[PDB]
Tab-separated table of C-alpha atoms and ligand atoms in Angstrom:
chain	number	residue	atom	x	y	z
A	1	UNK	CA	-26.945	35.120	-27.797
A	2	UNK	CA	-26.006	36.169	-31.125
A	3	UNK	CA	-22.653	38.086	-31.359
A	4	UNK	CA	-21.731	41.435	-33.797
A	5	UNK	CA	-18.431	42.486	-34.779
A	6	UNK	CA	-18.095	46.033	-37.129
A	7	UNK	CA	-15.938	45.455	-39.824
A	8	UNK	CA	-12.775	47.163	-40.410
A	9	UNK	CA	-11.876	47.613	-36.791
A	10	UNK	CA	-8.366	48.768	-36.401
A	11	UNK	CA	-6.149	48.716	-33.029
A	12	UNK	CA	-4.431	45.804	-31.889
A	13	UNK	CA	-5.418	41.695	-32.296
A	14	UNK	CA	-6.519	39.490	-30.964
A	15	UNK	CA	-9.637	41.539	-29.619
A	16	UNK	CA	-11.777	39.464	-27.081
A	17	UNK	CA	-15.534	38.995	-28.064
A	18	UNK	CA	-16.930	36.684	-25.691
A	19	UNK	CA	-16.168	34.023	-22.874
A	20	UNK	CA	-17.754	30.545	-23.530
A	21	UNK	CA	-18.208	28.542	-19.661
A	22	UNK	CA	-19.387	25.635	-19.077
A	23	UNK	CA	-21.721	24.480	-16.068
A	24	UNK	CA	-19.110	21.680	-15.666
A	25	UNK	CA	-16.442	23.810	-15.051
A	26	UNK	CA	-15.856	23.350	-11.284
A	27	UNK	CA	-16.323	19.400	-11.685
A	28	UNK	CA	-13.781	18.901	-14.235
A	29	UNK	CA	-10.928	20.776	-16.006
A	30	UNK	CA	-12.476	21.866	-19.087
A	31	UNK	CA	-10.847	22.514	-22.417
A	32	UNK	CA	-12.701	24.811	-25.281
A	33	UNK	CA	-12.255	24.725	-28.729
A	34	UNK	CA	-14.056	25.966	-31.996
A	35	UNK	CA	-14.968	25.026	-35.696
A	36	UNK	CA	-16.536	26.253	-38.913
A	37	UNK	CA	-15.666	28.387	-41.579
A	38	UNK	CA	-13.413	30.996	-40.323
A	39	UNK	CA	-12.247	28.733	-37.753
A	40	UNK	CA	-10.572	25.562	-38.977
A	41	UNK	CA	-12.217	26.097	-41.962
A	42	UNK	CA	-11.525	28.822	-45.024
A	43	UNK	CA	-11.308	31.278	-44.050
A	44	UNK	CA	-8.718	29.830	-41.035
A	45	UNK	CA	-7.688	31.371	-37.533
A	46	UNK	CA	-10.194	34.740	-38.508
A	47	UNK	CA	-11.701	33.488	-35.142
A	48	UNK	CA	-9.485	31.748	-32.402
A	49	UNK	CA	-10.614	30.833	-28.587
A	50	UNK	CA	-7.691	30.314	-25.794
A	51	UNK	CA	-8.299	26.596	-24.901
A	52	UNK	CA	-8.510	27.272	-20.962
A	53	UNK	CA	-10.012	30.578	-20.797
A	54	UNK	CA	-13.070	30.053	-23.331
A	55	UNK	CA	-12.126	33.463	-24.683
A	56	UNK	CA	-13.517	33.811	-27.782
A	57	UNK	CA	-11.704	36.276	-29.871
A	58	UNK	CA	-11.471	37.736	-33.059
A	59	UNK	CA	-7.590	38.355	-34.865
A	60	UNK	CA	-7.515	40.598	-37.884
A	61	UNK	CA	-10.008	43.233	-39.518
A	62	UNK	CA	-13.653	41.656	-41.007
A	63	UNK	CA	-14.845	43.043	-44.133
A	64	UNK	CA	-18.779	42.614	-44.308
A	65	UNK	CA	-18.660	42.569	-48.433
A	66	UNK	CA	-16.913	39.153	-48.455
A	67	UNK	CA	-18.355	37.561	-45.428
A	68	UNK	CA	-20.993	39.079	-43.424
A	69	UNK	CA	-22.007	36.234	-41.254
A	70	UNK	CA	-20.164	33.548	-39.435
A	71	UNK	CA	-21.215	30.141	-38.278
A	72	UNK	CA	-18.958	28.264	-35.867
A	73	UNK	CA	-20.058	26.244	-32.898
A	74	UNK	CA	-18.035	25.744	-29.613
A	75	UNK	CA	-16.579	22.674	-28.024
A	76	UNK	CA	-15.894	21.621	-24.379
A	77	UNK	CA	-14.267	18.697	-23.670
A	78	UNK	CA	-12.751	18.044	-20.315
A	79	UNK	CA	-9.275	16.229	-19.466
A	80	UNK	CA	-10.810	12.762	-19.577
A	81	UNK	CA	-11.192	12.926	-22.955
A	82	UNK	CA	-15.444	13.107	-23.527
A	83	UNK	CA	-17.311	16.154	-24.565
A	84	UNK	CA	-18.956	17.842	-21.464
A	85	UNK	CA	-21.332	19.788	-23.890
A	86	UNK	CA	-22.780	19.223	-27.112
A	87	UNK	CA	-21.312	21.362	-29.607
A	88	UNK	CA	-23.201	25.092	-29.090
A	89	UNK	CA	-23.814	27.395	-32.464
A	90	UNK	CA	-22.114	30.696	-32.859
A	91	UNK	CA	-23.596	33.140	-34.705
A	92	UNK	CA	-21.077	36.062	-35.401
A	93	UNK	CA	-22.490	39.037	-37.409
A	94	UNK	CA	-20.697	41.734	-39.262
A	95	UNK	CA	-21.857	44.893	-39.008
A	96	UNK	CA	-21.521	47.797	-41.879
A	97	UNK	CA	-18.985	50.258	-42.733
A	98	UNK	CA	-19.367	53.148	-45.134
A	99	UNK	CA	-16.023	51.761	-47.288
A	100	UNK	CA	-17.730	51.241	-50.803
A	101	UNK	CA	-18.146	53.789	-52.832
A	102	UNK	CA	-20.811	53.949	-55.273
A	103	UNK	CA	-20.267	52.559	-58.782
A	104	UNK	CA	-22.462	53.369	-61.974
A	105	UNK	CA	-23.569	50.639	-64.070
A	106	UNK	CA	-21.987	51.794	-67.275
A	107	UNK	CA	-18.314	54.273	-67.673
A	108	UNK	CA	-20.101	56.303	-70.446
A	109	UNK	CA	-24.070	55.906	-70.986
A	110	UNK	CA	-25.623	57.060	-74.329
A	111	UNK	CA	-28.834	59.356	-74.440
A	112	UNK	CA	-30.433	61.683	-77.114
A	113	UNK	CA	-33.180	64.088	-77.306
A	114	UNK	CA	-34.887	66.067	-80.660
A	115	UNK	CA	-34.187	69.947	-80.210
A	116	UNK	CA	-37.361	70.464	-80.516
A	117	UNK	CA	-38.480	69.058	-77.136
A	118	UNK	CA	-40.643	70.882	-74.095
A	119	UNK	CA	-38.383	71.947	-71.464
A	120	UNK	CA	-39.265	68.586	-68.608
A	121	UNK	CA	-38.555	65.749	-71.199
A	122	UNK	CA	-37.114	63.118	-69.631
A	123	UNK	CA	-33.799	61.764	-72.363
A	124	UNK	CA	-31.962	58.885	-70.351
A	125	UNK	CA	-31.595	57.214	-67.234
A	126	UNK	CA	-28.014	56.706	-65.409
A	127	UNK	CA	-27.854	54.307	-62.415
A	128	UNK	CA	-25.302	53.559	-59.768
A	129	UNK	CA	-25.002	50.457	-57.476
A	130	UNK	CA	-23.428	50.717	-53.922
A	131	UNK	CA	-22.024	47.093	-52.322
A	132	UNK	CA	-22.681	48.511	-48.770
A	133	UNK	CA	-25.343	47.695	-46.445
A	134	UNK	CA	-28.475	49.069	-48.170
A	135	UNK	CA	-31.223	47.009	-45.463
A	136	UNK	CA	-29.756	48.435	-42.386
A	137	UNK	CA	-27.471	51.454	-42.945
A	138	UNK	CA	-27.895	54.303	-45.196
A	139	UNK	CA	-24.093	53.657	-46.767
A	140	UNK	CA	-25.790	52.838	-49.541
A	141	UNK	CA	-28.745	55.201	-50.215
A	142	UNK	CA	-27.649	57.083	-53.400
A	143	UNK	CA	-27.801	60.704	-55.008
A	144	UNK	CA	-27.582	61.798	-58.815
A	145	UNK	CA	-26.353	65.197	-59.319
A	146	UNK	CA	-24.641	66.557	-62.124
A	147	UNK	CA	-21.164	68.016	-61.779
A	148	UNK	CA	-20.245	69.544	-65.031
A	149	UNK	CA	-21.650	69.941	-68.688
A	150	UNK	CA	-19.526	70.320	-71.794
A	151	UNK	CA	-20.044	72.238	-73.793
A	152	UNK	CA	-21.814	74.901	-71.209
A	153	UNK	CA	-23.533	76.277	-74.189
A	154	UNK	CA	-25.704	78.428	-74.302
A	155	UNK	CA	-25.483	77.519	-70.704
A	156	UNK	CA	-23.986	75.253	-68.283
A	157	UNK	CA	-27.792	73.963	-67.019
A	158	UNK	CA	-28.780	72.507	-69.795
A	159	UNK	CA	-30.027	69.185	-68.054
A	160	UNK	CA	-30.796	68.534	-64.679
A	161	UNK	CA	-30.859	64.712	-62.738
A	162	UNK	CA	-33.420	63.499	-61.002
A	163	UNK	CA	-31.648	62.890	-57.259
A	164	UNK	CA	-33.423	59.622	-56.844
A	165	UNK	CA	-34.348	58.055	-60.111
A	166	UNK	CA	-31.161	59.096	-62.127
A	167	UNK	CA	-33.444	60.452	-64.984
A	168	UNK	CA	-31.557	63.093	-67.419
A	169	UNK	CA	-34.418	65.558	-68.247
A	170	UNK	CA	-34.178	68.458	-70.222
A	171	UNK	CA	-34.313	71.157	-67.749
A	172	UNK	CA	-34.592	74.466	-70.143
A	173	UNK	CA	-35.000	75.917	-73.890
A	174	UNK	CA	-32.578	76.334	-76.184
A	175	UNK	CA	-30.907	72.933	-77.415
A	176	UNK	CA	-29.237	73.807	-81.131
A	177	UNK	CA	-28.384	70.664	-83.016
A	178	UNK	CA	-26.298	73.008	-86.051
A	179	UNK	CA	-24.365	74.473	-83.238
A	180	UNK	CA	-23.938	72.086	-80.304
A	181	UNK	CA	-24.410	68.500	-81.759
A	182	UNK	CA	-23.698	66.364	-78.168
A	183	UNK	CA	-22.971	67.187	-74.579
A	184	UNK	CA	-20.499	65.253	-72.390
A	185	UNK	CA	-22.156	65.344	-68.896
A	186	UNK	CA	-19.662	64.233	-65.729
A	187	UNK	CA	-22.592	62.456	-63.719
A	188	UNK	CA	-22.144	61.684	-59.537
A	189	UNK	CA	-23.561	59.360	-57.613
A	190	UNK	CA	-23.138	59.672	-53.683
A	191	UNK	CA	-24.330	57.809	-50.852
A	192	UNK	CA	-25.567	58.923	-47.419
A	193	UNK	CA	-28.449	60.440	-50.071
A	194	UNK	CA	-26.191	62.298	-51.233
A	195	UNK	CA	-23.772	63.363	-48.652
A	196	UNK	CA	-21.531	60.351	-48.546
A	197	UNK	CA	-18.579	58.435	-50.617
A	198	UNK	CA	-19.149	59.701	-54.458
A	199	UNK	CA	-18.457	58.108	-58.031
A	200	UNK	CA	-18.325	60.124	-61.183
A	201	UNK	CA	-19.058	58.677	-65.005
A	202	UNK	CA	-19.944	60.359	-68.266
A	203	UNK	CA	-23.687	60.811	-70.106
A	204	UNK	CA	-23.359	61.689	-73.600
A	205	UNK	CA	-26.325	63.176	-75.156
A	206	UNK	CA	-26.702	63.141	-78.832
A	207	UNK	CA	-29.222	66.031	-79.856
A	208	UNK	CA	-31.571	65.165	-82.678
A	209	UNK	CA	-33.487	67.108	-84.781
B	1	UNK	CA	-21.306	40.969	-22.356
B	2	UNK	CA	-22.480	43.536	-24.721
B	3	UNK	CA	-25.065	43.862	-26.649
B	4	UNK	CA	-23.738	45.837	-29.030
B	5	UNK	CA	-25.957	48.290	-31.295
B	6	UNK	CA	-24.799	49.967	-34.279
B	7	UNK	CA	-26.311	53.639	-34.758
B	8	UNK	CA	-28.105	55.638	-37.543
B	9	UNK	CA	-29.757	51.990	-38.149
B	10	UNK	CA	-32.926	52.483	-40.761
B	11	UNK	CA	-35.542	50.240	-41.664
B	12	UNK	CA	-38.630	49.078	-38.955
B	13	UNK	CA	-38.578	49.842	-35.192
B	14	UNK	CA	-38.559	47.992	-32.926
B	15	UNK	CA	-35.376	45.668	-33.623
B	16	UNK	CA	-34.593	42.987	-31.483
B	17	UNK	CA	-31.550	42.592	-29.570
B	18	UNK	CA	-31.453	39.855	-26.778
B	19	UNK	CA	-34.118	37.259	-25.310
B	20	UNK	CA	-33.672	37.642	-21.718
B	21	UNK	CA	-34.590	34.293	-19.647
B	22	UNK	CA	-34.462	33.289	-16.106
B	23	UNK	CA	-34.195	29.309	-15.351
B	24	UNK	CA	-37.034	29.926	-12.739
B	25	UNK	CA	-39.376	30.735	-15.240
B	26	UNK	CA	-40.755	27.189	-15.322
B	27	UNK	CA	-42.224	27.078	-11.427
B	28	UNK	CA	-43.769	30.541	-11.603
B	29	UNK	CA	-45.079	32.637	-14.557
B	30	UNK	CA	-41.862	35.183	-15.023
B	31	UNK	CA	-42.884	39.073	-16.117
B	32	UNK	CA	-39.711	40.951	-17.339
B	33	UNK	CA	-38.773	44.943	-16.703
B	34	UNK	CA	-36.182	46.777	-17.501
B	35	UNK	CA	-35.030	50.187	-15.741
B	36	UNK	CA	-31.716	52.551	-16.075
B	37	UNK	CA	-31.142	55.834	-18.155
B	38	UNK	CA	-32.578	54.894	-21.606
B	39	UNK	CA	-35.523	52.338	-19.967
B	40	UNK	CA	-37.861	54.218	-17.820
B	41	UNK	CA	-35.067	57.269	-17.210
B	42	UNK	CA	-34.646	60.356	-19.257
B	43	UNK	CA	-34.101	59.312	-22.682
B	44	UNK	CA	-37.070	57.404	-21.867
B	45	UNK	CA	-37.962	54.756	-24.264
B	46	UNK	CA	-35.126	54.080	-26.575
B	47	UNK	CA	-35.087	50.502	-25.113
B	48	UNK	CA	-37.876	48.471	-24.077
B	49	UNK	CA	-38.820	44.521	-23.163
B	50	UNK	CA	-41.685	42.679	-24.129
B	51	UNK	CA	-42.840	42.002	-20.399
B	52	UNK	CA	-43.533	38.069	-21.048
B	53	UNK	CA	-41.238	36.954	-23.949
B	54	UNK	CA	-38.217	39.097	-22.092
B	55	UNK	CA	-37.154	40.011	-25.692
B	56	UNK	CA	-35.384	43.592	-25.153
B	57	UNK	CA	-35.789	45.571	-27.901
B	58	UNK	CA	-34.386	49.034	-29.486
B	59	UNK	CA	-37.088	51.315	-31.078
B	60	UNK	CA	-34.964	54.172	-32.636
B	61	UNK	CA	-31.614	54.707	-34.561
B	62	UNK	CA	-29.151	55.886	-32.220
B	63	UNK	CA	-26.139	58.546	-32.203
B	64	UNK	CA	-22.821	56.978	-30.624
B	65	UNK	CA	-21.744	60.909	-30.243
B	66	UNK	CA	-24.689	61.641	-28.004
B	67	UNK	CA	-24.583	58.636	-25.883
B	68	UNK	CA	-22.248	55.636	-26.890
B	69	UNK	CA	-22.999	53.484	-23.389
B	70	UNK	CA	-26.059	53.058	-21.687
B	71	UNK	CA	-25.940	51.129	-18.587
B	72	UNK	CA	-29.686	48.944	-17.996
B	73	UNK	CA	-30.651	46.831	-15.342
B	74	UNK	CA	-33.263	43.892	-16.480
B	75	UNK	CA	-35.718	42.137	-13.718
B	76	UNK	CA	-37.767	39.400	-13.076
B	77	UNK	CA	-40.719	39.368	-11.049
B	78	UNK	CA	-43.488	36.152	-10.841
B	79	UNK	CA	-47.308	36.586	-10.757
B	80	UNK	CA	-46.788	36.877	-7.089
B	81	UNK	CA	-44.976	39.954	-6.845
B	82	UNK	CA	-42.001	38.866	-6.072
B	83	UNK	CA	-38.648	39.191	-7.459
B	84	UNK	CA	-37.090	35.995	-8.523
B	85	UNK	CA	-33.549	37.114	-9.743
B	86	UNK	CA	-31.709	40.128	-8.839
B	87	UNK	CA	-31.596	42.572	-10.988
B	88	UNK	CA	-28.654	42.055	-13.770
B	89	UNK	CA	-26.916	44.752	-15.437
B	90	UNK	CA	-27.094	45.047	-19.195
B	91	UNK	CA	-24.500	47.403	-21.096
B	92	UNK	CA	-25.229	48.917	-24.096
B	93	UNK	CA	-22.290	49.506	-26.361
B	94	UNK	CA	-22.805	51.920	-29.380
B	95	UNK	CA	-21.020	51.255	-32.305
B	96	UNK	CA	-19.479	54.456	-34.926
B	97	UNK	CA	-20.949	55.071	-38.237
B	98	UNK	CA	-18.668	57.777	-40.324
B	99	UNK	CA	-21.717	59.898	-40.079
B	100	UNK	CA	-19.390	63.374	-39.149
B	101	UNK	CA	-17.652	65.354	-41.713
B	102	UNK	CA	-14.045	66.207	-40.455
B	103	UNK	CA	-14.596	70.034	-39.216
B	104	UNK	CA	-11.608	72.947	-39.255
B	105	UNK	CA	-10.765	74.365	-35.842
B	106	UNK	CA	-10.955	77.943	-37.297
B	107	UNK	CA	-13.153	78.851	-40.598
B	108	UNK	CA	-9.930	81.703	-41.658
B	109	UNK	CA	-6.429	80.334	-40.582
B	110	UNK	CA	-3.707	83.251	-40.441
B	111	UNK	CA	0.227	82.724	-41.357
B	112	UNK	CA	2.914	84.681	-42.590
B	113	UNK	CA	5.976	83.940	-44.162
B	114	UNK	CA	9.449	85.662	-45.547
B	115	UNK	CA	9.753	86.011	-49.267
B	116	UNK	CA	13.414	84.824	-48.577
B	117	UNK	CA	12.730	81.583	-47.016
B	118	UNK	CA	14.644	78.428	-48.517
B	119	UNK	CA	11.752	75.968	-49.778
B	120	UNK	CA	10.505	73.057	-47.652
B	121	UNK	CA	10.348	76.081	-44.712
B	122	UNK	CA	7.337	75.351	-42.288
B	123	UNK	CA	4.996	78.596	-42.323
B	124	UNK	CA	2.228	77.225	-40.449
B	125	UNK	CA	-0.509	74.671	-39.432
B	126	UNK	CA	-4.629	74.005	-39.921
B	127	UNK	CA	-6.360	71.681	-37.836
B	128	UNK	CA	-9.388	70.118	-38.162
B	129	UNK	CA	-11.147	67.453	-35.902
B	130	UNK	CA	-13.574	64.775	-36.354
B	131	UNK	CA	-16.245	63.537	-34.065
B	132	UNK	CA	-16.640	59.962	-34.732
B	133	UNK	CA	-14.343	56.864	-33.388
B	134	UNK	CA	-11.185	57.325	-33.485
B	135	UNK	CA	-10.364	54.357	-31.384
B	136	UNK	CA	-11.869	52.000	-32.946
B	137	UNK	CA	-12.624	52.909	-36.550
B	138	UNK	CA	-10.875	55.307	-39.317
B	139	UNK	CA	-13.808	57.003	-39.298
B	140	UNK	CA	-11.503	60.146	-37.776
B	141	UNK	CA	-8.745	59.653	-39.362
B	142	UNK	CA	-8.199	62.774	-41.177
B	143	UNK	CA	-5.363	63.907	-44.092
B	144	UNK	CA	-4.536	67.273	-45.389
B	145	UNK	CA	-4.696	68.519	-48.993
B	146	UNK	CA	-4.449	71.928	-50.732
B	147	UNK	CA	-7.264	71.959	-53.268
B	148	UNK	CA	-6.699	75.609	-54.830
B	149	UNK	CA	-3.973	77.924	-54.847
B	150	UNK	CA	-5.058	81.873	-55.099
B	151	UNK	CA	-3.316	83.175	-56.926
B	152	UNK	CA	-1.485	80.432	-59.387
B	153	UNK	CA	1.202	82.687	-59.840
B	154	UNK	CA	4.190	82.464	-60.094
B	155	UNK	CA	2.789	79.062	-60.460
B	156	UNK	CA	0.080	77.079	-58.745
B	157	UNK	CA	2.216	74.814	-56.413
B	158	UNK	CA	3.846	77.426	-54.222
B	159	UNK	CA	2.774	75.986	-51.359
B	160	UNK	CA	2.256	71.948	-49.684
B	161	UNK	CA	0.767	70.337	-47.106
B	162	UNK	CA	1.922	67.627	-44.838
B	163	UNK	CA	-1.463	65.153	-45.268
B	164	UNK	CA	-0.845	64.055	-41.970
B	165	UNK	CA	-0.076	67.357	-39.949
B	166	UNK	CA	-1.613	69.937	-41.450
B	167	UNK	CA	1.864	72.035	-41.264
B	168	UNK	CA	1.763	74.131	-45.042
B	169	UNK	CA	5.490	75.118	-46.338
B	170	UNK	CA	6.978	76.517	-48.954
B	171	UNK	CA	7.511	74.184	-51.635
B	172	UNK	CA	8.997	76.403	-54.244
B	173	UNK	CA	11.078	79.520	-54.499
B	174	UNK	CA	9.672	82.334	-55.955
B	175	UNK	CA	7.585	84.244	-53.214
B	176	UNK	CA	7.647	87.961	-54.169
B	177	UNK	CA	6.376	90.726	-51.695
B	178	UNK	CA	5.900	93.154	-54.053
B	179	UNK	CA	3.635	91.865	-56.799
B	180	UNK	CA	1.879	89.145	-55.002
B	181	UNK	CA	1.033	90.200	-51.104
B	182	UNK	CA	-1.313	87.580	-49.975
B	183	UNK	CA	-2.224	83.871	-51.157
B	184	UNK	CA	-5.901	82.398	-50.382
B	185	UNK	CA	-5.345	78.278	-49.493
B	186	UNK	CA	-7.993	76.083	-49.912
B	187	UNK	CA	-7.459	73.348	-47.903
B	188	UNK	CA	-9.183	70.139	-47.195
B	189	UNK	CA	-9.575	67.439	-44.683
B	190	UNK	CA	-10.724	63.839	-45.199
B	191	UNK	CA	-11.358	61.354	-43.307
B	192	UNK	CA	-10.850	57.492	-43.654
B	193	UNK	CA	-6.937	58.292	-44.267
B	194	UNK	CA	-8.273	60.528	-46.994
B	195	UNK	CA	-11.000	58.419	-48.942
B	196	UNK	CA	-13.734	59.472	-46.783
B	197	UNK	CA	-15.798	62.653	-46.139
B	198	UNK	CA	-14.554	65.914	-46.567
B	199	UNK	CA	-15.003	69.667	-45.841
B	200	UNK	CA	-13.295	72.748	-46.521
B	201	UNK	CA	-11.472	75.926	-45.182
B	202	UNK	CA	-9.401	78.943	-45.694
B	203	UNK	CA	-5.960	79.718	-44.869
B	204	UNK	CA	-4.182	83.031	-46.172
B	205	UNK	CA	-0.774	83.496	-45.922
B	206	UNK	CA	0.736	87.058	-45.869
B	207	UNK	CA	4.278	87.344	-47.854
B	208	UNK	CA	6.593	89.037	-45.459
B	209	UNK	CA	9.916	91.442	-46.158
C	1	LIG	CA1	-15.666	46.112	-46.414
C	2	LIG	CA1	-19.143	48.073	-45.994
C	3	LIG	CA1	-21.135	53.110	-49.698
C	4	LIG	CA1	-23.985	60.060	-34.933
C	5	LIG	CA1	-20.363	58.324	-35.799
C	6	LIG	CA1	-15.904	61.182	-39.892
């Protein structure tokens, strides 16, 4: 059966994952051993098995963002020298941990909007990407809000976000072009949709006539 | 061996898990069961098997802090109607998701403290808890910051906070009775050794002598 290992797991190592037998064990003294890519492979000794026991066992913290799946296959030879087995696939999964927060596309995106326009025009998009696990966990479902607005003239609501789309829309009357030429917006993004790990950039909106 | 399921899991239910199989299924026609606390037992449901494939299944996220282990037993009984294996116990280990916000013991924590006292004097301490895996994970693992001082005066960094403890002293001398009486702390706790989520409370401190 396929195995799954969190990532990030702290405590002490080795931690045990699973012991491999063989059927052959009580005719012969049996020795185990494994290969692959996190075995004797790069990455090396991420995955070790005690040559008697058949424990298979894991020896430092996984991170699912550089490998999230292992491939290794298991070998049992016994003292005579001749594989008792033929060499039996490992699957080792690595499951998610919230420990990426979100990160827009851009430090400082560039919008603009005429003065003139209706209160629900949409001006510019921001967007955020989040290197978690967006197919099975939600550590990587994001939120737009916006945290400040300078200047706050003649209020500090000027614009509002659109929590899932990341669309800038002007959210009331009252843009002024002669007396408040641009707007430096601190934008967030979150995960968790929107209760999560959180990001902040800028959105600088250029008002036009 | 575990069978391990992470919770909070999104995406299309149900999700396969294991492939239960019983050598004797090539005499007799095998039909698979499962029963236990989580099978056909109050939570009923949360895991079932396809009766002929013996593929056990989960058909909902899960919540580690409601139930972390569930303890199944699987069976197999031929087109006879008669049980071929005894029944084999299946453990169900539930893995953490930092899905809990680190939460204050109190909402108003209440301290006093001399206006004399030398600075780097303890005055008192705020605790906060989190519910998720502290074992395992550093999805508890929760540090202590001041975020606003009320009022800045003398100067906003009267007091500090061990990030570890949550024991607030006096960090600088100045700590007059009679024109300042009572400071408002807000203090924070966050978990993943500070990186992760976060919530507030209160702590005032009353200026003695
Ligand atoms: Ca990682
Ligand atoms: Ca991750
Ligand atoms: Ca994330
Ligand atoms: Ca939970
Ligand atoms: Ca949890
Ligand atoms: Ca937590």
């Amino acid at each position: 059966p396929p195995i799954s290992c969190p990532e990030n797991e702290k405590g002490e190592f080795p931690k045990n994952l699973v012991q491999i037998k063989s059927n052959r064990d009580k005719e012969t003294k049996v020795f185990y051993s494994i290969t692959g890519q996190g075995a004797d492979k790069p990455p090396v000794g991420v995955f070790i098995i005690e040559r008697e026991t058949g424990w298979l066992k894991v020896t430092q913290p996984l991170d699912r963002e550089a490998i999230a799946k292992y491939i290794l296959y298991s070998h049992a030879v016994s003292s005579n020298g001749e594989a008792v087995e033929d060499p039996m696939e490992i699957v080792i999964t690595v499951t998610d941990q919230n420990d990426n927060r979100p990160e827009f596309t851009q430090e400082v995106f560039e919008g603009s909007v005429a003065e003139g326009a209706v209160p629900g025009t949409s001006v510019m998009k921001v967007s955020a990407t989040d290197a978690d696990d967006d197919v099975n966990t939600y550590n990587a479902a994001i939120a737009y809000t916006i945290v400040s607005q300078d200047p706050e003239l003649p209020h500090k609501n000027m614009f509002t976000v659109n929590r899932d789309t990341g669309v800038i829309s002007v959210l009331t009357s009252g843009l002024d072009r002669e007396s408040y030429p641009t707007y430096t917006l601190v934008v967030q993004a979150a995960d968790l949709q929107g209760e999560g790990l959180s990001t902040t950039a800028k959105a600088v909106i250029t008002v036009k006539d």
